[PDB]
Amino acid sequence: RECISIHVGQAGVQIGNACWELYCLEHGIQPDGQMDSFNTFFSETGAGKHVPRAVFVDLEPTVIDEVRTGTYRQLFHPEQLITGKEDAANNYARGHYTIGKEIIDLVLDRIRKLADQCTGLQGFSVFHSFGGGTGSGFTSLLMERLSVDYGKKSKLEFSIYPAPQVSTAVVEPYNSILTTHTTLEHSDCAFMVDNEAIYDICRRNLDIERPTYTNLNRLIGQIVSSITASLRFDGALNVDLTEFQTNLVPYPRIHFPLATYAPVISAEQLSVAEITNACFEPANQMVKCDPRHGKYMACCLLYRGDVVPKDVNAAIATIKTKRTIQFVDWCPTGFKVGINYEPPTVVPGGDLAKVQRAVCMLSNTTAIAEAWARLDHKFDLMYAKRAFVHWYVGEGMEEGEFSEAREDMAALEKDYEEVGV
Amino acid sequence: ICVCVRKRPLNKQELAKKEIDVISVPSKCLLLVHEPKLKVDLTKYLENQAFCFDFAFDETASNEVVYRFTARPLVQTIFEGGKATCFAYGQTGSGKTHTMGGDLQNASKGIYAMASRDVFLLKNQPRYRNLNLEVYVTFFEIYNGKVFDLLNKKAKLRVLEDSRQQVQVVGLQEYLVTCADDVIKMINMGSACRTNSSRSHACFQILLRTKGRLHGKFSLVDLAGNERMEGAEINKSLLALKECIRALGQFRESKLTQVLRDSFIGENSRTCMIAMISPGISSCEYTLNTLRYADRVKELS
Amino acid sequence: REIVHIQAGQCGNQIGAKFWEVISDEHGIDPTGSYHGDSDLQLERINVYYNEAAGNKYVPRAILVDLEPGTMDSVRSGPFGQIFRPDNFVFGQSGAGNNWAKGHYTEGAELVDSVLDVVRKESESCDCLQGFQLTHSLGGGTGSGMGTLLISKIREEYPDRIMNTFSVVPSPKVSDTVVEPYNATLSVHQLVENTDETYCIDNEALYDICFRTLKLTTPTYGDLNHLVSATMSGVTTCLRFPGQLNADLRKLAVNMVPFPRLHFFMPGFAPLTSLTVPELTQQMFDAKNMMAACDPRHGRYLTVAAVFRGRMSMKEVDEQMLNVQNKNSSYFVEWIPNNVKTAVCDIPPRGLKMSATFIGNSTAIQELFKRISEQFTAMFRRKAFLHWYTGEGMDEMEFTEAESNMNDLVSEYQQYQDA
Numbered sequence A: 001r002e003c004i005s006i007h008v009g010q011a012g013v014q015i016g017n018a019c020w021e022l023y024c025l026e027h028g029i030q031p032d033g034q035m036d037s038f039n040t041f042f043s044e045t046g047a048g049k050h051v052p053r054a055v056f057v058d059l060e061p062t063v064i065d066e067v068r069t070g071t072y073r074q075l076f077h078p079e080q081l082i083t084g085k086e087d088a089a090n091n092y093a094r095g096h097y098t099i100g101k102e103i104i105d106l107v108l109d110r111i112r113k114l115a116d117q118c119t120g121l122q123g124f125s126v127f128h129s130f131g132g133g134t135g136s137g138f139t140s141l142l143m144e145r146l147s148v149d150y151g152k153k154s155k156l157e158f159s160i161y162p163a164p165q166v167s168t169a170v171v172e173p174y175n176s177i178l179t180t181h182t183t184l185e186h187s188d189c190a191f192m193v194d195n196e197a198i199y200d201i202c203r204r205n206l207d208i209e210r211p212t213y214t215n216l217n218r219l220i221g222q223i224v225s226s227i228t229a230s231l232r233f234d235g236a237l238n239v240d241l242t243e244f245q246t247n248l249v250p251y252p253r254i255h256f257p258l259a260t261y262a263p264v265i266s267a268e269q270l271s272v273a274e275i276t277n278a279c280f281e282p283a284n285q286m287v288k289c290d291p292r293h294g295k296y297m298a299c300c301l302l303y304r305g306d307v308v309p310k311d312v313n314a315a316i317a318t319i320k321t322k323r324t325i326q327f328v329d330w331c332p333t334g335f336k337v338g339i340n341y342e343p344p345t346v347v348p349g350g351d352l353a354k355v356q357r358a359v360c361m362l363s364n365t366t367a368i369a370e371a372w373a374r375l376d377h378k379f380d381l382m383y384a385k386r387a388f389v390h391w392y393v394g395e396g397m398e399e400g401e402f403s404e405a406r407e408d409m410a411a412l413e414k415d416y417e418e419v420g421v
Numbered sequence B: 001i002c003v004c005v006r007k008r009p010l011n012k013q014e015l016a017k018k019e020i021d022v023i024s025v026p027s028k029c030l031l032l033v034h035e036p037k038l039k040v041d042l043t044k045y046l047e048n049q050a051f052c053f054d055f056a057f058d059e060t061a062s063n064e065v066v067y068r069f070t071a072r073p074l075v076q077t078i079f080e081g082g083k084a085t086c087f088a089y090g091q092t093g094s095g096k097t098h099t100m101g102g103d104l105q106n107a108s109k110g111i112y113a114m115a116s117r118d119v120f121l122l123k124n125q126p127r128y129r130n131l132n133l134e135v136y137v138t139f140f141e142i143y144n145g146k147v148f149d150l151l152n153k154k155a156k157l158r159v160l161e162d163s164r165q166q167v168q169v170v171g172l173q174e175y176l177v178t179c180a181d182d183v184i185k186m187i188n189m190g191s192a193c194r195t196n197s198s199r200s201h202a203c204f205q206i207l208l209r210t211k212g213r214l215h216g217k218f219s220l221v222d223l224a225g226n227e228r229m230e231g232a233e234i235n236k237s238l239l240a241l242k243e244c245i246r247a248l249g250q251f252r253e254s255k256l257t258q259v260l261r262d263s264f265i266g267e268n269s270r271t272c273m274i275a276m277i278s279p280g281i282s283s284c285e286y287t288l289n290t291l292r293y294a295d296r297v298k299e300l301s
Numbered sequence C: 001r002e003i004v005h006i007q008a009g010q011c012g013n014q015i016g017a018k019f020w021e022v023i024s025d026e027h028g029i030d031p032t033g034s035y036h037g038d039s040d041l042q043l044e045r046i047n048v049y050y051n052e053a054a055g056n057k058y059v060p061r062a063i064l065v066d067l068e069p070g071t072m073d074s075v076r077s078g079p080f081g082q083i084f085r086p087d088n089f090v091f092g093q094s095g096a097g098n099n100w101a102k103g104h105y106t107e108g109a110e111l112v113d114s115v116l117d118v119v120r121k122e123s124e125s126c127d128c129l130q131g132f133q134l135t136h137s138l139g140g141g142t143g144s145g146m147g148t149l150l151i152s153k154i155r156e157e158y159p160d161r162i163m164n165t166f167s168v169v170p171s172p173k174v175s176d177t178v179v180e181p182y183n184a185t186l187s188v189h190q191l192v193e194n195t196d197e198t199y200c201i202d203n204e205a206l207y208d209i210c211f212r213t214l215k216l217t218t219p220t221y222g223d224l225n226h227l228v229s230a231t232m233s234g235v236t237t238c239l240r241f242p243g244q245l246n247a248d249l250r251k252l253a254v255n256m257v258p259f260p261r262l263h264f265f266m267p268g269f270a271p272l273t274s275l276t277v278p279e280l281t282q283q284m285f286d287a288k289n290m291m292a293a294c295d296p297r298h299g300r301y302l303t304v305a306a307v308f309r310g311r312m313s314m315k316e317v318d319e320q321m322l323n324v325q326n327k328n329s330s331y332f333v334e335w336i337p338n339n340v341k342t343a344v345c346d347i348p349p350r351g352l353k354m355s356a357t358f359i360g361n362s363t364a365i366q367e368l369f370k371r372i373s374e375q376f377t378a379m380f381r382r383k384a385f386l387h388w389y390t391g392e393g394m395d396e397m398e399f400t401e402a403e404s405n406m407n408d409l410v411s412e413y414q415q416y417q418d419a
Ligand SMILES: Nc1nc2c(ncn2[C@@H]2O[C@H](COP(=O)(O)OP(=O)(O)OP(=O)(O)O)[C@@H](O)[C@H]2O)c(=O)[nH]1
Pocket: A008, A009, A010, A011, A012, A014, A015, A058, A059, A060, A087, A088, A089, A090, A129, A130, A131, A132, A133, A134, A135, A136, A160, A161, A162, A163, A166, A167, A168, A195, A213, A214, A216, A217, A220
């Protein structure tokens, strides 16, 4: 039925800022206010306005302040925008303990103020950074507590895996490992987004020498749109969360599906068979790695626009003939195909053009663990000397919690590899 | 440098909560951790890890047995004019205080006492009689970079260090002991006013003096749990301790290592590290942390 | 989020005075008046360095401290003399010192409260206080001794927020006192304990830059301050300007200092005196261009932070910045991953069309501590001029205790040229 969006911390906020704008454009809601189906994400407030079911939280104003500034200012309620004066400082230990504690009760209560006008809520979609102050810290704490106040209700996280070039912070790897540990036993399914992969797609495709955040976010916007879409329009693909995940995660170990967007092509018609063909192409992923190496244990195809199954079929047939199928031992050959006739609308001054048809493909491969390694190594190697640990012990964390968390990442990397044939 | 590990048995509370014992010590130098794990598909299995120490003690080992293979061999070192240190290291509730100070309470049953007992026996031996030594004892605790005299009512002391770099703890009270019963009286007194539970570093010392000069010194240390951001001081001291001990068989200073500095710099100095382990499945991550720290310490031998 | 600025003792006061008038014209501020200059940015984070009062007026969040009038009235009847808030000046009147003791105990303590009580007003006025930054010299005493005190008393009232200092470490050439090494060592110890980051501006380095590479014969305290003053603007840029980073100054700390012992940064500037980019980097990473007498060669970098300036393409910067830690890829500790971060801002400094500045936590800094500890133990050997302090109340072993702490700092930096 219903569906709350939560955006915590800079990356979280800005990403959502850009996909709540693609949402509006998709459903045609003039910023100001007005124009079920569209109801999954909005609450028809007042006798005009349309307003989102979202909450934005950051531990410094800055980011949120620009939201209450640029158009869309009217779009939200003043309450759904929570801000916190003192910064997260860039260390989980602060976001999860010291500085968080102070704002958790006020957020927690407001999101419940939102869930109250929702006859039979469904779950939360949460957007946050992997490394990064409050993105790691506060998130982790939110999720712990959301699990206390909302037993069943699923939690779908949209995480941003950090990458050297689209500037990180030295301590980033600590933060990532840290949150992903606590946060793991509390999420149902999470969508990782490698900032290197998106920086990468903006280069090979959009042809931008210096990709901005505002440039990256736009693209991510689209991937997210295509992911939710199904449950916004409505009678189409992955209906009512649950049957969304029941489709991708075979094991409680929160599995992170690998996302691949269809045709990304700059402004200023691609064949149904061709875009599917571009979906089994590493250069177009969302997490830098490669599944021609690992195995697949559940494939998903989410189309949008002008498409008849008649082709989608013949495109699959030929997509297996001269390709690396490599499906895993004990699991069918998935391919829950979903088509959503509603065409892919893109932002007006955007860098990508209108497209006749687009695909999405969400696969849960074992090769996604190649990213869990790339992070562990960084962490392991710094921790080898307590590199920056003292800043965390400083806010009140135990040196043990650092072990205890990497300890899980050692385990996860094992599980992932263990699923192989 | 000698490194040992001691497993304590499951206590009443743990047995009642039906805690599983995941520690085995199949030989006198081998300790096994039966680490519970889940495959990605939720399948239960064991990753049985092996660690080797100079001496591994099981749950049936008494304090006297532990003492015999850890601190006992270091007493002679102080009579030979050296500096010895024995550290009890491990997680909160692993048995550190029980081993060094007495069961719990009972001073006589702990390493401080037992070591004292052998110090009086040796000083009366012919090979040492002619040394004409006097036995002194001290008991202090380190809390948040601060030193407190436990034999002088938690009196806060000052720690200074010239340029030549030796450290001196101004005001620390040295008490003359001529009998094990004497030592037991100072241990009870000190333990009675200590800041059971960690939060500090406990250090009971046995000094040998002859004529204005220090002959030898044995520092017995009851460390704080290795697992309110004071954990930063505790972790820095433990990190500092490790490097000081390793520097012995070949910083980022802290109070503990500053005060015990002279016991790691001499060539005639020995140390023993005893790693305490709580056998419960719920403490498995704390155990592995203790064991790996121990591995790196003995790694310098 | 918002920072107060303490500035104490002849050197500090002079150093900071140039800092102030240098950023003030960057932001476009009159001796009193407000804005004037077709730029628009400036004002975003003007907040950070300027508590603003009656009408327009901008008045910097600055506290002025000294133990002798002169130096203060040098500022008042000087550059931007009218700019500072009148009862923000805290005169000393009595004997200066040029002896640590006096400033950290006797003549020092005397004032402390009256200053502390004025920092207390500025701070509590702040909407959300970020921390303090102080300028002073390590040699001499009216700021190396009162300063290290002022800070010992800020923490305690503000454990919370962070402590930042720009400290000029003194040398045998261009010095007024034989005792500097005593004053220096005595402070170095204090800094180690109560500050989060400290920038080292070595006067030995400073002199070298003017004469060894700038044809400038007699280096005034003037063209010398011009170096420090330009460097200081470069180092703060990212917290006073754009909307790229933002700089929690705590983020800066958590990210630059891997080890508790507050690690001291050696700064470096691009073009100088009173620029292709590859040409700019090659220079900003050159010993001959560091603000501290060292030479990153005889030591690895723990972490580095560089901040460019002016209309130039980051495409080139990110490229050249990779090309340094490659032709020199052995000198960047490999146990800390992406340990060299670069920030670009597009508002040019004074003159200069292009500019860059550099912040470096390098184990080579060890070299600097070693050389002051060299003239210290070289004098405290046969207890030199020591009776000047003994007399003001200090103990003999408070010197050994400082010396001992200091050599460790060397024995730690030298420990981290590991693997
Ligand atoms: N894709 C994307 N990544 C971002 C964006 N903003 C920041 N990041 C990334 O997010 C990570 C840092 O997270 P932050 O949002 O800055 O951390 P935060 O604590 O949540 O926010 P702050 O309180 O401002 O520190 C790094 O991986 C950055 O590359 C964004 O707008 N889009």
